[PDB]
């Protein structure tokens, strides 16, 4: 999920739109 | 927001300040 991805690695608004429907 | 490592539910709470507009689906559990 998006915040797990932000805790470990790079994070972008494309990963927001992946779950922020 | 972009490319910084802010972690736990403070980024769930800030997601309502960052994605902002719609009021969202948000399904990958909820990030405790």
Domain assignments of chain B as residue spans, ordered by start: 1-32
Phi and psi angles of residue B15, each rounded to the nearest 5 degrees, phi first: -60, -35
A9-13 own/partner pairs: CB under 8 Å, 24+ apart:
A10/B3, A11/B1, A11/B2, A11/B3, A11/B4, A11/B5, A12/B2, A12/B3, A13/B1, A13/B2
Q: Is B26 left (phi over 0), alpha (psi -120 to 50) or beta?
A: left
Q: How many CA atoms lie within 13 A of A8 on its CB side?
A: 5
CB B9 within 8 Å of CB A7: no
Identify the experimental approach: NMR
- Residue B28 has its nearest CB partner, among A7, A11, A19, at A19
Q: Counting one residue from A and one from B, how many pairs have CB atoms under 8 Å apart? A: 51
- Residue A16 has its nearest CB partner, among B4, B19, B27, at B19
CB B26 within 8 Å of CB A20: yes
**Cα dihedral across residues B9, B12, B18, B20: positive or negative:** negative
Distance of CA A17 to the CA centre of its chain: 8
Choose, out of B1, B10, B14, the residue to mutate when testing the contact with A (most A CBs < 10 Å): B1
């Amino acid at each position: 999920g998006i915040v797990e991805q932000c805790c470990t690695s790079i994070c972008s608004l494309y990963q927001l739109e992946n779950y922020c429907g | 927001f972009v490319n910084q490592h802010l972690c736990g539910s403070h980024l769930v709470e800030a997601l309502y300040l960052v994605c902002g507009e719609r009021g969202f689906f948000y399904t990958p559990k909820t990030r405790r």
